[PDB]
Amino acid sequence: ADSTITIRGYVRDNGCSVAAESTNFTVDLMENAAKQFNNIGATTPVVPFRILLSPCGNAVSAVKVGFTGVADSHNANLLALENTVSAASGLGIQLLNEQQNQIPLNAPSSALSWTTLTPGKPNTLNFYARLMATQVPVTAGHINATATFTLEYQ
Amino acid sequence: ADVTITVNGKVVAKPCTVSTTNATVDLGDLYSFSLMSAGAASAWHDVALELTNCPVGTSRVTASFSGAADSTGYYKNQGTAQNIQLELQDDSGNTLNTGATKTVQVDDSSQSAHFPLQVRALTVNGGATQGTIQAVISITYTYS
Amino acid sequence: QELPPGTYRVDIYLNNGYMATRDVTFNTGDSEQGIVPCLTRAQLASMGLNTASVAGMNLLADDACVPLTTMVQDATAHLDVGQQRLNLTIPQAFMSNRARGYIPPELWDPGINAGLLNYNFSGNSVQNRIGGNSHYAYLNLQSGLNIGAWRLRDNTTWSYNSNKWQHINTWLERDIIPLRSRLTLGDGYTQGDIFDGINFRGAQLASDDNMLPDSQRGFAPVIHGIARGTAQVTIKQNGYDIYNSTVPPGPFTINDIYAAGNSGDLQVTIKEADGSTQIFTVPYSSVPLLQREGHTRYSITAGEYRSGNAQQEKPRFFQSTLLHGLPAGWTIYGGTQLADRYRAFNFGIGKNMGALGALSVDMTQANSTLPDDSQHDGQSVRFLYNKSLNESGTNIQLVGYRYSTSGYFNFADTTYSRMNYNLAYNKRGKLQLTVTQQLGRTSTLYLSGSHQTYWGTSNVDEQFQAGLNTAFEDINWTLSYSLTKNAWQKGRDQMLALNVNIPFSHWLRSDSKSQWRHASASYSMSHDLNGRMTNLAGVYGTLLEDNNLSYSVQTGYAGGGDGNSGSTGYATLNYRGGYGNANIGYSHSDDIKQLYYGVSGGVLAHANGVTLGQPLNDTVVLVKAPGAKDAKVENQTGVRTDWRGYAVLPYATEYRENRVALDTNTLADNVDLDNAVANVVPTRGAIVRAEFKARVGIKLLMTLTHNNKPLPFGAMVTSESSQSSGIVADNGQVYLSGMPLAGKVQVKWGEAHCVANYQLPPESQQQLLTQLSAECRS
Amino acid sequence: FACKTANGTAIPIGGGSANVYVNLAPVVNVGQNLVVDLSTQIFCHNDYPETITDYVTLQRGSAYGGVLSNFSGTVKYSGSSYPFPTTSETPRVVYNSRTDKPWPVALYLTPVSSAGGVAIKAGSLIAVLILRQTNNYNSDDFQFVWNIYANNDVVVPTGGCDVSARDVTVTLPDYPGSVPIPLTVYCAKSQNLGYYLSGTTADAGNSIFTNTASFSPAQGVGVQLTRNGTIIPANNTVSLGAVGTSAVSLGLTANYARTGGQVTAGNVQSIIGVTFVYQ
Amino acid sequence: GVALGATRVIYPAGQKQEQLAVTNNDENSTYLIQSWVENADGVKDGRFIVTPPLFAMKGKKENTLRILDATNNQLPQDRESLFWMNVKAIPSMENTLQLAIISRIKLYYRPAKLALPPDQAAEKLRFRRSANSLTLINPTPYYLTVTELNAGTRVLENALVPPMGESTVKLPSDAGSNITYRTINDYGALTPKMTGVME
């Protein structure tokens, strides 16, 4: 104690590193050269796509999720594609959760649910999506679109 | 030699002056995101210590540490946050434990010396709690 | 799955891990699909394979069809051409750069070639009641100069008291990167590794540790195993998962994480994907002389001797040191000393037994020629035991003993000029001991002792300390005892002393803006067993905002023993100006009355001029952002820019990343940057610029149309007038800055169409932000 | 004629020849220094004063003994200073008394040093005395050598002045203590005198002797001296002036001296000779 | 692999801008950032200024974002104010599909010199144990961020209570008795469990 030594400080909180998954489409007129099926034509091999909910904070524990996109005209619960001459015709994209249940588009925050999290240790969302032949039939073309996920926090 | 005379003596070293007594550095506040892995640590930070005005013959001084370490051997935080330990070494990269000691030389001319030392912090187990941070260490000296 | 053998365009994986997509030729052979590719070693080294990790591969050709499943064990290839992949399973030892936090060294900086001064004057004046006044004058001097890697340093001083130069210290040095090492010419001192620290002038070539990822620094036991299939191993210690990873199949080893022998021992738990776990535990203690295996530490030292005694000689010499890590805890090491009247040779091994605590014994023999030409041989031996932490909070930190013959002496014992340093009473043996004990939660006791025997005289020098800490949660209880005793003199050398420290923040509002949270006091006492009981109170802390100036106040009282009672007094202020640092101290103790002053600083000869500022540490970054005036560099104390727009930081780690952050709130209303954060990896002794694109001028949002439309999104804009350039938001909006008041604008999105033009009224000047709307050319 | 003394009374060995064990008072004198009176010791008597009167003379060649044997003086035979070494035969002392009567011989010394002296141990040979006892009784001459040993170790003057003592040992108050050096010198006679120094120096200015520390050596500081402002170069004679019987001090003060640079703490030790000059 | 400074923002009165670090960690992928604030009604009206409002980021970078006023004191200074930061993250550049990511976080404009020190607010929420419901009344000028509602046994729902406000929530009757809960501090951390007082 002839000399004295001191450090002070705090910890700053940090959010979640969020990594996505881009899915190519390679179905290539299996569904559409065969069908010729009604506007409920969501016969399409779904893809489990993941969200890397890692790393995160600690008090980060339960949040609210949500999605925006161009609602298809026939079913607003389908994603319309990009308005392209090189595209297909008569399709709308259906989202499915990890339990394979169709997800409501553009729903307000009042209906949302607290996605409970694992503090510290990593998490990952593993969902599905498919193509629903709205018009009968579907002509060939490109399958291009964008969508948006927003998370409102804890 | 008509008469021969025997003259004797001894010189012993006295306390010098300090230059200071009052080291304190805050480092700002960061992320247990960035400190998530077990055994993650901070960035080092410099500290120099002088002691001046030394009596004649005084050549070497041992520095004698003191601090509150936990069972890691690294120093326990006294702030509210947890899982967090402290890291002082020399600039020869050698662990400065509580109670420990280190002798250095003294410059002949300037009657003084300095202490090139480095400090950072750490987690051991990773994923520390969030809160406040407090740390105080003491040091005495012996002379040579 | 399966296509017939032949050449395919296929996404090459490696345990599902994509590398590239090569046309690969297949043959009816041996895999999961009955087919083998013809791969080249040039492909595989371009794929992740350490080629020399598999022996027998250098003797192959460059492009011969690699028999990998046979030459390499636990190695499978599997094609899946339904998805066109090649899932490859390899034992991990055949890859590289698995050091977490690896840095490629070609990313390292040389720096600039530039000069350097570092000065300091200081001094005091004392008034004596008997004798009067006393005035002292010492200026310090540290220059340097760097060209690429040529690192030249000199220090010296000037003197005057109530009176001249003295040349002190100089060296030029340079590293070699593939040799991983550092050579220096000039003044130097040796290292206390096997032998003793020796000042000299010469050549000194040493392996540098500080290139390592620090996960390699320190010893860790290197862990071997073989995975059957893909597994995941968790590793624990003290109940904490100290390591986890999923692991591929195959033999493997572990060169991993920072060690802690006083964390207990290792809790290894190997979950193969079946669920079967391969459990054992791993011991760990350490010698401070250990090497992690594969490392090899060395130095090559030669030159002429330097001391500082007139009564000696300065001859030429040589000395060599070398160490290399070994299997099974064994440890070779060795250097030797080769000089004129003299030769000296060590012999080695130390070892960790793991279960029994680490231990080392070594022995050196030397040949000597005394200045009366009596020539002798001798031997010496040393013994060092370690035992780590037990469950009872107990650590054996060091056990040390050394012994030598009568005929054993040192090279330093020889160096002299005239004959008759009392060499008839060399030491026999030396004992030292280091153990503490964890005391529950809120206490700790430290225990140290050392012991020293001599040939000839019957006198032994000993040293002892016991130090105890208790903390009641603000309250710092300190109680320690000292006891040494010495041969050349008489008296039992002891002291007992105590302290409690108290802070002031722990009583007030933590968000009160009082400086009084940054203040504290303490009170201490002691007694000598010999009359003198003494005590001390001290109140100290920080000051105005940056705490660059700060205060210390104390006094104590002395009593007993000699009848020299007395009060004290010390008051000291230290300020750090941006140009350099300066303080004034004061003592009064009633006979003693004295006053303390001193100013340091550092000077930079660079290409853009000369920079002045605070003291220096060995590697400094230039801050280049012209136009800055008073710039808070974040987490940096006393660090601002000049009136020009430049600054420096001496603060440096190296071979490691460093981060440069700036306050916006300290900025002026008219200049902008793009990223206030920079990052470097420097080497040792270098110089970095911190360049930042400043934008001086007026700051402005506009919402612009053309063809009665907000023009399409994300287009590119430049100023014709200024250099500044912009990117179009929605609604025909773009923010820009660094601008003049009147002018013209070029905009490209298709083929460049739009050209706008403008003039704001000048009264829009006390506003940082202005807004308007207009149209284009096209 | 039985003789005796008080202190040693060493044996009449080989007839009337003998050793002796005597204490010493060698005295600085003008002309020739006193060494030893023998009437202080030697108490001879005629056992029969009635039958015989012993006629004891000394024959010549009775010299000093040991290293003393090369020297000259006088010898106060019956109080009469007859020249030394004995080159003639002296007259007789008659012995006709039962009283152990003193034997009147005192020894003198031709002084040749400055104020110097020769220290002699106990028991060593000091002188060789060829005496001769005839008698009135008959022609019983028997001639015999009285050899001189001591019972103590005494310094004899060889010069004509004298000091307090020849051996002073001091230790400083430690750093930066300096001591006045206590010693005074008188003479038998007013003599212009001087002195210089001796010992291995450190400085070329001859003002700093070295520390010849034996164990735990302090270094960097040697032996500086003064008289009262006066730093003394070695081997340079400072005068004294015409000094006689007054014991006068030399005004000296011993001092540290920073020889070189880095100062080694520890123990300090040096022994210094002085040399006295007839002026 | 993108992230922000933190979650929650105070704009104190008297301030000039607010700084906000945001960061991508990945060293190749490029992103475009839109930034806009809506009110507590979720309506974008440009009342506060985020610079740079639109940009891109390739490689492992960072940006500090400054936020300014554009209202000039037209707001009820008696209590704090909620707004919504809306942060659009765009992957930059074959039959594919991707997502954009928005951070919609709060904003608390704190005015100058309100009465109660905010720590002393967590004790001032009063209640009314009403039927299958609950009334939960804020007498104070603070937004109130409550969780861990354990009315005896049943772990219940999160709540925001307006400054000078209240809330009424649903109650399943198959619960325990005592209101036990935690809330959030001014630093995101959990305040301890407390006890509810109705009537």
Q: Say if residue D32 is exposed, middle or buried (CB neighbours under 10 Å; 0-12, 13-18, 19+).
A: buried
Question: Helix (H, G, I), strand (E, B), or coil: what is residue A34?
Answer: helix
Residues pairing with C176 in the sheet: C181
Torsion angle of the four alpha carbons C677, C682, C685, C688, in this order, in degrees rounded to the nearest 10? -40
Please name the helix (run of DSSP H) or strand (run of DSSP E) that holds residue C487, with its range, or none.
none
Residues pairing with D146 in the sheet: D18, D129
Please name the helix (run of DSSP H) or strand (run of DSSP E) that holds residue A33, with its range, or none.
helix A30-34
Alpha carbon of C144 to those of B122, C153, C200, C478, C685: distances in Å?
Answer: 35, 4, 20, 45, 10
C676 contacts in chain E (CB < 8 Å): 64
The phi, psi pair for A6, rounded to 5°, reads: -145, 135
The phi, psi pair for A17, rounded to 5°, reads: -75, 125
Question: Are D166 and D155 spatial neighbours (Cβ–Cβ below 8 Å)?
Answer: yes
Question: Are C629 and C137 spatial neighbours (Cβ–Cβ below 8 Å)?
Answer: no
Residues contacting residue C12 through CB under 8 Å, at least 6 positions apart: C18, C19, C20, C21, C22, C24, C47, C85, C86, C88
Where do the domains of chain B lie, and which CATH numbers do they carry? 2-144 (2.60.40.1090)
What tokens were used for C128? 């004596």
B44 contacts in chain C (CB < 8 Å): 653
Asked if A22 and E25 come within 8 Å (Cβ–Cβ), the reply is no
E119 touches chain C (CB under 8 A): no
From D120's Cα to the closest Cα of chain C, the distance in A is: 30
Question: Are C760 and C770 spatial neighbours (Cβ–Cβ below 8 Å)?
Answer: yes
Residues D44 and D24 in one domain: yes
C615 contacts in chain B (CB < 8 Å): 48
Gap between the Cα atoms of D12 and C275, Å rounded: 117
How was this one solved? cryo-EM
Q: Write C654-657 long-range contacts (CB < 8 A, 24+).
A: C654/C210, C654/C619, C654/C681, C654/C682, C654/C683, C654/C684, C654/C686, C655/C103, C655/C108, C655/C210, C655/C211, C655/C681, C655/C682, C655/C683, C655/C684, C656/C103, C656/C681, C657/C681
Question: Which residue, D215, D234, D225, is CA-closest to D256?
Answer: D225
Residues D235 and D186 in one domain: yes
> How many CB atoms are closer than 10 A to CB E155?
12
Q: Which of D213, D262, D266 sits opposite C308 (nearest CB)?
A: D262
What tokens were used for D170? 């001091």
Question: Helix (H, G, I), strand (E, B), or coil: what is residue B29?
Answer: coil
Where do the domains of chain C lie, and which CATH numbers do they carry? 7-94 (3.10.20.410), 223-282 (2.60.40.3110), 600-695 (2.60.40.2610), 697-772 (2.60.40.2070)
Which residue blocks in C440-543 are alpha helix, DSSP H? Answer: none
Please name the helix (run of DSSP H) or strand (run of DSSP E) that holds residue A30, with its range, or none.
helix A30-34
What tokens were used for C33? 């699909």
What tokens were used for B84? 């967090």
What tokens were used for C390? 């037990």
B16 contacts in chain D (CB < 8 Å): none
Gap between the Cα atoms of E65 and E63, Å rounded: 6
3-state DSSP helix/strand/coil % of chain E, to nearest 5: 0, 50, 50
Could you give the angle at the alpha carbon of D121 between the alpha carbons of D120 and D124, nearest 5°? 95
The domain E116-199 having CATH identifier 2.60.40.10: the answer here is: yes
Question: Are B45 and B119 spatial neighbours (Cβ–Cβ below 8 Å)?
Answer: yes
Residues pairing with A79 in the sheet: A71, A93
A18 contacts in chain E (CB < 8 Å): 1-3, 101
What tokens were used for A6? 């001191």
B111 touches chain D (CB under 8 A): no
Q: Say if residue C69 is exposed, middle or buried (CB neighbours under 10 Å; 0-12, 13-18, 19+).
A: middle
**DSSP letter (8 states) at residue C42:** H
Asked if C476 and B71 come within 8 Å (Cβ–Cβ), the reply is no
Of the CA atoms within 13 Å of residue C367, those in its CB half-sphere come to: 8
Q: Say if residue C163 is exposed, middle or buried (CB neighbours under 10 Å; 0-12, 13-18, 19+).
A: exposed
Question: Which residue, C570, C568, C572, C571, is CA-closest to C590?
Answer: C568
E105 contacts in chain A (CB < 8 Å): 152-153
Portion 79-138 of A in contact with B at CB < 8 A: 120
Altogether, the residues listed in chain C come to a count of: 778
- Give the domain CATH number at D224: 2.60.40.1090
Gap between the Cα atoms of C332 and C324, Å rounded: 6
Q: Which residue has the tokens 């010199």?
A: E113
Question: Helix (H, G, I), strand (E, B), or coil: what is residue C425?
Answer: helix
Gap between the Cα atoms of C87 and C278, Å rounded: 26
Question: Are C685 and C151 spatial neighbours (Cβ–Cβ below 8 Å)?
Answer: yes
B105 touches chain C (CB under 8 A): no
Question: Are A99 and A93 spatial neighbours (Cβ–Cβ below 8 Å)?
Answer: no
Residues contacting residue A132 through CB under 8 Å, at least 6 positions apart: A39, A40, A41, A42, A44, A75, A78, A91, A92, A93, A94
User: D261 lies in which domain range?
Assistant: 158-279
Gap between the Cα atoms of A89 and A69, Å rounded: 18
User: Largest alpha-carbon pair distance within chain E?
Assistant: 64
Alpha carbon distance, N-terminus to C-terminus of chain D: 51
Question: Helix (H, G, I), strand (E, B), or coil: what is residue D267?
Answer: strand
Q: Say if residue C687 is exposed, middle or buried (CB neighbours under 10 Å; 0-12, 13-18, 19+).
A: buried
Gap between the Cα atoms of C21 and B132, Å rounded: 52
B13 touches chain D (CB under 8 A): yes
Question: Are C521 and C539 spatial neighbours (Cβ–Cβ below 8 Å)?
Answer: yes
The phi, psi pair for C517, rounded to 5°, reads: -70, -25
The phi, psi pair for C775, rounded to 5°, reads: -125, -175
Question: Which residue, A46, A23, A17, A5, is CA-closest to A122?
Answer: A17
Q: Which residue has the tokens 């005209």?
A: A73
Torsion angle of the four alpha carbons A82, A83, A88, A89, in this order, in degrees rounded to the nearest 10? 120
E92 touches chain A (CB under 8 A): no
Q: Is the peptide bond before D85 cis (omega within 30 degrees of 0)?
A: yes
Residues D134 and D214 in one domain: no
Torsion angle of the four alpha carbons D4, D6, D7, D10, in this order, in degrees rounded to the nearest 10? 10
> How many CB atoms are closer than 10 A to CB A123?
16
Residues D72 and D194 in one domain: no
**DSSP letter (8 states) at residue D258:** B
Please name the helix (run of DSSP H) or strand (run of DSSP E) that holds residue C692, with its range, or none.
none
Residues D8 and D120 in one domain: yes
Portion 50-109 of E in contact with B at CB < 8 A: none
D1-30: burial string, b at 16+ Cβ within 10 Å, e else: bebebeebbbeeeeebbbbbbbebebbbbe
Question: Are C671 and C197 spatial neighbours (Cβ–Cβ below 8 Å)?
Answer: no
Gap between the Cα atoms of D99 and D83, Å rounded: 30
Residue of A nearest to C519 (CA): A6
Asked if E102 and A148 come within 8 Å (Cβ–Cβ), the reply is yes
For A71-152, list the strands marked E by DSSP. Answer: 92-96, 115-116, 123-132, 147-152
Residues D50 and D176 in one domain: no
Q: Which residue has the tokens 């009564």?
A: C311
Where residue C131 falls (left for φ over 0; alpha for ψ -120 to 50; beta otherwise) is: left
Do chain B and chain E touch with ≥3 beta carbon pairs under 8 Å?
yes
C501 contacts in chain A (CB < 8 Å): 1
Most E CBs within 10 A among C701, C717, C724, hence the mutation to make, goes to C701
The phi, psi pair for C611, rounded to 5°, reads: -110, 140
What tokens were used for E100? 């954009």
Q: Are strands A147-152 and E99-105 parallel, antiparallel or unpaired?
A: parallel
What tokens were used for C698? 């007026």
Gap between the Cα atoms of E80 and E63, Å rounded: 27
Asked if A10 and B23 come within 8 Å (Cβ–Cβ), the reply is no
For chain E, which residues make up each domain, given as ranges? Answer: 2-112, 116-199
Q: Which residue has the tokens 């996404």?
A: C11
Question: Are C62 and C38 spatial neighbours (Cβ–Cβ below 8 Å)?
Answer: no
Alpha carbon of B127 to those of C493, D98, D238: distances in Å?
Answer: 48, 120, 86
Torsion angle of the four alpha carbons C240, C246, C252, C258, in this order, in degrees rounded to the nearest 10? -30
Alpha carbon of E179 to those of D82, E125, E183, E195: distances in Å?
Answer: 135, 12, 13, 5
Question: Which residue, D22, D191, D31, D2, is CA-closest to D97?
Answer: D2
User: Largest alpha-carbon pair distance within chain C?
Assistant: 108
Alpha carbon of C270 to those of C51, C232, C273, C280, C776: distances in Å?
Answer: 28, 6, 9, 9, 69
Of the CA atoms within 13 Å of residue D257, those in its CB half-sphere come to: 22
> How many CB atoms are closer than 10 A to CB D255?
20
Q: Is the peptide bond before A48 cis (omega within 30 degrees of 0)?
A: no
At position C269, the amino acid (one-letter code) is T
Residues pairing with C468 in the sheet: C445, C479
Question: Helix (H, G, I), strand (E, B), or coil: what is residue C414?
Answer: helix
Alpha carbon of C258 to those of A93, C216, C238: distances in Å?
Answer: 51, 8, 15
User: Largest alpha-carbon pair distance within chain B?
Assistant: 87
What is the number of domains present in chain D? 2
Residues D121 and D3 in one domain: yes
